[PDB]
Amino acid sequence: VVGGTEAQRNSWPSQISLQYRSGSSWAHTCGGTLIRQNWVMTAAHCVDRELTFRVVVGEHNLNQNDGTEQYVGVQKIVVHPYWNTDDVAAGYDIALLRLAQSVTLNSYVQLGVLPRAGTILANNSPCYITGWGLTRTNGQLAQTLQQAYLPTVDYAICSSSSYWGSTVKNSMVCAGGDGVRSGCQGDSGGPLHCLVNGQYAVHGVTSFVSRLGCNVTRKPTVFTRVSAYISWINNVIASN
Ligand SMILES: *[C@@](O)(c1nnc(C(C)(C)C)o1)[C@@H](NC(=O)Cn1c(-c2ccccc2)ncc(N)c1=O)C(C)C
């Protein structure tokens, strides 16, 4: 997250860190959202590689024992049937991970609430992106969970020429684009929390940014619109 601030320890309990084993250690690669005690929602492009993954919940500082972490393995990965490797502009950038074990819920580990199917947010809706991603373009990962106020940019504006044009689809959500704050490498697969009716719900799964850089003016961070896949999500968990 570029232009963010450190999130409080118990602010975003649904956030998880998706890690893969590199050598004899584990390294954070993407974010994700806990939606069931044994199911995690993330980006398809995060699990496109033939790597061994693990999930960490109750995580705050990547390199320090917080005394709240739970480490669980991934037992099954379900990518959207229409997902096309490396083709993030086509959409369908979403995947579900079935955990090897059910995690324990407490003040640091909670399920993120999903929006009702078809829900679209008004322009400039208050949202927050969270993650341990790069704090600067071509910089380095954050040590502690970061958060940044990222207001939505409706489809009409985001799909305009001065913005993303045809690259963005209606199955996506645009947030930010002020040139100061944004998502960045390592935030992928994570949640976009938006305030709706006094409650925070996960309306997006972080997908991509401009090839030019993370925080580019008029190039908001793009997310998969969660509300467009509620039926798919329910179908997967129900038969797995
Ligand atoms: C997303 O954070 C993410 N996913 N993988 C990674 C690495 C491996 C840590 C860099 O970071 C990142 N978004 C993207 O990387 C999306 N992206 C791609 C792309 C496509 C397929 C697989 C990986 C990456 N390609 C081009 C551009 N412009 C992208 O943003 C953050 C959300 C910024």
Coordinates of C-alpha atoms and ligand atoms in Angstrom, one line a residue:
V1 CA 0.0 0.0 0.0
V2 CA 1.4 3.3 -1.1
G3 CA 0.5 6.4 1.0
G4 CA -1.0 4.4 3.8
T5 CA -0.8 4.4 7.6
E6 CA -0.3 1.5 10.1
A7 CA -3.6 -0.2 10.8
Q8 CA -4.5 -0.9 14.4
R9 CA -4.1 -4.5 15.6
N10 CA -7.8 -5.3 15.7
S11 CA -9.2 -3.2 12.8
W12 CA -9.3 -5.7 10.0
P13 CA -9.7 -9.2 11.4
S14 CA -10.7 -10.8 8.1
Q15 CA -7.4 -9.9 6.4
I16 CA -4.9 -12.8 5.8
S17 CA -1.4 -13.2 4.4
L18 CA -1.0 -15.8 1.6
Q19 CA 2.5 -17.3 1.8
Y20 CA 4.5 -19.7 -0.3
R21 CA 7.5 -21.7 0.7
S22 CA 10.7 -20.3 -0.8
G23 CA 13.8 -22.3 0.1
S24 CA 13.5 -23.3 3.7
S25 CA 11.4 -20.2 4.6
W26 CA 7.9 -18.9 3.9
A27 CA 7.4 -15.6 2.1
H28 CA 4.3 -13.3 1.8
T29 CA 3.1 -13.0 -1.8
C30 CA -0.5 -11.9 -1.6
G31 CA -3.3 -10.9 0.6
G32 CA -6.7 -12.5 1.0
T33 CA -10.0 -12.5 3.0
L34 CA -11.3 -15.1 5.4
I35 CA -14.9 -15.8 4.4
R36 CA -15.5 -19.1 6.1
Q37 CA -13.6 -20.7 9.0
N38 CA -12.0 -22.9 6.4
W39 CA -12.3 -20.9 3.2
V40 CA -10.3 -18.0 1.9
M41 CA -11.0 -15.6 -1.0
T42 CA -8.1 -14.2 -3.0
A43 CA -7.0 -13.3 -6.6
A44 CA -6.7 -16.0 -9.2
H45 CA -3.4 -14.6 -10.4
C46 CA -2.0 -15.1 -6.9
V47 CA -2.4 -18.9 -7.1
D48 CA -1.5 -19.4 -10.7
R49 CA 1.9 -20.8 -9.9
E50 CA 2.8 -24.4 -9.0
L51 CA 3.9 -23.4 -5.5
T52 CA 3.1 -24.7 -2.0
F53 CA 0.9 -22.2 -0.2
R54 CA 0.0 -21.5 3.4
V55 CA -2.3 -19.0 5.1
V56 CA -1.7 -16.8 8.2
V57 CA -4.5 -15.3 10.1
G58 CA -4.3 -12.9 13.1
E59 CA -1.1 -11.5 11.5
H60 CA 0.1 -8.0 12.1
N61 CA 3.9 -7.8 11.8
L62 CA 5.3 -10.2 9.2
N63 CA 8.7 -10.5 10.8
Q64 CA 7.7 -10.5 14.5
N65 CA 5.7 -12.8 16.7
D66 CA 2.5 -11.0 17.6
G67 CA 1.2 -13.9 19.7
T68 CA -2.1 -13.9 17.7
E69 CA -1.1 -15.8 14.6
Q70 CA -2.6 -19.1 13.4
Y71 CA -0.8 -21.0 10.5
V72 CA -2.9 -23.2 8.3
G73 CA -2.1 -25.1 5.1
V74 CA -4.1 -24.9 1.8
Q75 CA -5.7 -28.2 0.9
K76 CA -7.6 -27.2 -2.3
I77 CA -7.5 -24.3 -4.7
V78 CA -10.5 -23.4 -6.9
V79 CA -9.8 -20.8 -9.6
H80 CA -12.7 -19.3 -11.6
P81 CA -13.3 -21.4 -14.7
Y82 CA -13.1 -18.3 -16.9
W83 CA -9.8 -17.1 -15.5
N84 CA -7.2 -16.7 -18.2
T85 CA -3.6 -16.8 -16.9
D86 CA -1.6 -13.5 -17.2
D87 CA -4.8 -12.0 -18.7
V88 CA -5.9 -9.8 -15.8
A89 CA -7.7 -7.3 -18.1
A90 CA -10.3 -9.9 -19.0
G91 CA -11.5 -10.2 -15.4
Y92 CA -12.5 -13.4 -13.5
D93 CA -9.5 -12.7 -11.3
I94 CA -10.8 -14.6 -8.2
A95 CA -10.1 -17.9 -6.5
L96 CA -11.2 -19.8 -3.4
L97 CA -8.9 -21.7 -1.1
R98 CA -10.1 -24.5 1.2
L99 CA -8.0 -24.6 4.3
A100 CA -6.6 -27.9 5.7
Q101 CA -8.1 -27.0 9.0
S102 CA -10.7 -24.7 10.5
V103 CA -9.3 -21.6 12.2
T104 CA -10.4 -20.3 15.6
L105 CA -12.3 -17.0 15.6
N106 CA -11.4 -14.3 18.2
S107 CA -10.9 -10.5 18.2
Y108 CA -8.1 -10.8 15.7
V109 CA -9.6 -13.5 13.4
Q110 CA -13.1 -12.8 12.0
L111 CA -15.0 -13.6 8.8
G112 CA -15.3 -10.7 6.3
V113 CA -18.9 -9.9 5.4
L114 CA -19.8 -10.1 1.7
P115 CA -22.1 -7.8 -0.2
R116 CA -25.5 -8.8 -1.6
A117 CA -25.3 -9.9 -5.3
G118 CA -25.4 -7.1 -7.8
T119 CA -24.6 -4.3 -5.4
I120 CA -22.8 -1.4 -7.1
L121 CA -21.5 1.5 -5.0
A122 CA -22.1 5.2 -5.7
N123 CA -19.1 7.2 -7.0
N124 CA -16.8 8.4 -4.2
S125 CA -17.9 5.7 -1.7
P126 CA -15.7 5.5 1.4
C127 CA -13.5 2.4 1.3
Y128 CA -10.1 1.3 2.7
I129 CA -7.5 -0.9 1.1
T130 CA -5.3 -3.0 3.4
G131 CA -2.2 -5.0 2.9
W132 CA 1.5 -5.6 3.4
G133 CA 2.4 -4.7 -0.2
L134 CA 5.0 -2.3 -1.5
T135 CA 4.9 1.1 0.3
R136 CA 6.4 2.7 -2.8
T137 CA 6.6 1.9 -6.5
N138 CA 9.6 -0.5 -6.9
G139 CA 10.1 -0.3 -3.1
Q140 CA 9.7 -2.9 -0.5
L141 CA 7.0 -4.8 1.4
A142 CA 5.6 -3.3 4.6
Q143 CA 6.4 -5.0 7.9
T144 CA 3.1 -4.1 9.6
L145 CA -0.4 -4.1 8.0
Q146 CA -1.0 -0.8 6.2
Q147 CA -4.3 0.9 5.3
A148 CA -5.3 3.7 3.0
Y149 CA -8.5 5.6 2.4
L150 CA -9.5 4.8 -1.2
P151 CA -12.8 6.2 -2.4
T152 CA -14.5 4.5 -5.3
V153 CA -14.5 5.8 -8.9
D154 CA -17.7 4.7 -10.7
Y155 CA -17.6 2.6 -13.9
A156 CA -18.7 5.5 -16.1
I157 CA -15.7 7.6 -15.0
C158 CA -13.1 4.8 -14.6
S159 CA -13.9 3.4 -18.1
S160 CA -13.4 6.8 -19.7
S161 CA -10.4 7.6 -21.8
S162 CA -8.6 9.8 -19.3
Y163 CA -8.7 6.9 -16.9
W164 CA -8.6 3.1 -17.7
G165 CA -10.7 3.1 -20.8
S166 CA -11.7 -0.3 -22.2
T167 CA -9.2 -2.1 -19.9
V168 CA -11.7 -2.0 -17.0
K169 CA -15.0 -3.9 -17.1
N170 CA -18.3 -3.7 -15.2
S171 CA -17.2 -6.8 -13.2
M172 CA -14.5 -4.6 -11.6
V173 CA -14.4 -1.8 -9.0
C174 CA -12.1 1.2 -9.2
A175 CA -10.8 3.0 -6.1
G176 CA -8.3 5.8 -5.5
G177 CA -6.4 7.3 -8.4
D178 CA -5.2 10.5 -6.7
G179 CA -1.5 10.0 -7.4
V180 CA -0.7 9.6 -3.7
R181 CA -2.4 6.5 -2.4
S182 CA -3.0 3.1 -4.0
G183 CA -2.4 -0.6 -3.9
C184 CA 1.0 -2.0 -4.9
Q185 CA 2.7 -5.3 -5.5
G186 CA 2.0 -7.7 -2.6
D187 CA -1.5 -6.3 -1.9
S188 CA -3.0 -8.4 -4.6
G189 CA -5.8 -10.8 -3.6
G190 CA -6.6 -8.6 -0.5
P191 CA -9.8 -6.8 0.5
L192 CA -11.3 -3.4 -0.3
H193 CA -13.5 -2.6 2.8
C194 CA -16.3 -0.3 2.1
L195 CA -18.7 1.3 4.6
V196 CA -22.3 0.5 3.8
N197 CA -25.2 1.0 6.2
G198 CA -22.9 1.5 9.1
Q199 CA -21.0 -1.7 8.5
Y200 CA -17.8 -2.6 6.6
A201 CA -18.1 -5.1 3.8
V202 CA -15.5 -6.5 1.3
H203 CA -16.6 -5.2 -2.1
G204 CA -13.3 -6.0 -3.9
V205 CA -10.4 -8.3 -4.3
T206 CA -7.2 -6.3 -5.3
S207 CA -6.2 -7.2 -8.9
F208 CA -4.0 -4.7 -10.8
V209 CA -2.5 -1.3 -11.2
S210 CA -0.9 0.7 -14.0
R211 CA 2.2 -0.7 -15.7
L212 CA 3.7 2.8 -15.2
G213 CA 3.6 2.6 -11.4
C214 CA 1.4 1.9 -8.3
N215 CA 0.3 5.5 -7.5
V216 CA -0.4 7.1 -10.8
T217 CA -2.8 10.0 -11.2
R218 CA -6.1 8.9 -12.8
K219 CA -5.1 5.3 -12.8
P220 CA -7.0 4.0 -9.8
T221 CA -6.3 0.6 -8.3
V222 CA -8.5 -2.0 -9.9
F223 CA -10.4 -4.7 -8.0
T224 CA -12.6 -7.7 -8.9
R225 CA -16.1 -6.7 -8.0
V226 CA -17.1 -9.3 -5.3
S227 CA -20.8 -8.7 -5.7
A228 CA -20.6 -10.1 -9.3
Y229 CA -19.5 -13.5 -8.0
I230 CA -21.8 -14.2 -5.0
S231 CA -23.6 -17.0 -6.7
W232 CA -20.3 -18.6 -7.9
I233 CA -18.8 -18.4 -4.4
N234 CA -21.8 -20.0 -2.8
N235 CA -21.8 -22.8 -5.4
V236 CA -18.2 -23.6 -4.8
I237 CA -18.3 -23.8 -1.0
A238 CA -21.6 -25.7 -1.2
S239 CA -20.1 -28.5 -3.4
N240 CA -16.6 -28.6 -1.8
Ligands
LIG1 C1 -0.6 -7.9 -7.1 O1 -0.1 -7.4 -6.0 C2 0.4 -9.1 -7.1 N1 0.3 -10.3 -7.5 N2 1.6 -10.8 -7.7 C3 2.4 -9.9 -7.4 C4 3.9 -10.0 -7.3 C5 4.3 -11.4 -7.8 C6 4.3 -9.9 -5.8 C7 4.5 -9.0 -8.1 O2 1.8 -8.8 -7.0 C8 -0.2 -6.6 -7.9 N3 -1.0 -6.6 -9.2 C9 -0.4 -7.2 -10.2 O3 0.8 -7.7 -10.1 C10 -1.2 -7.3 -11.5 N4 -0.4 -7.0 -12.6 C11 0.1 -8.0 -13.5 C12 0.1 -9.4 -13.1 C13 -0.5 -10.4 -13.9 C14 -0.4 -11.7 -13.6 C15 0.3 -12.1 -12.5 C16 1.0 -11.2 -11.7 C17 0.9 -9.8 -12.0 N5 0.6 -7.6 -14.7 C18 0.6 -6.3 -15.0 C19 0.2 -5.3 -14.1 N6 0.1 -3.9 -14.4 C20 -0.3 -5.7 -12.9 O4 -0.7 -4.9 -12.0 C21 -0.7 -5.3 -7.1 C22 -2.2 -5.3 -7.0 C23 -0.2 -4.1 -7.7

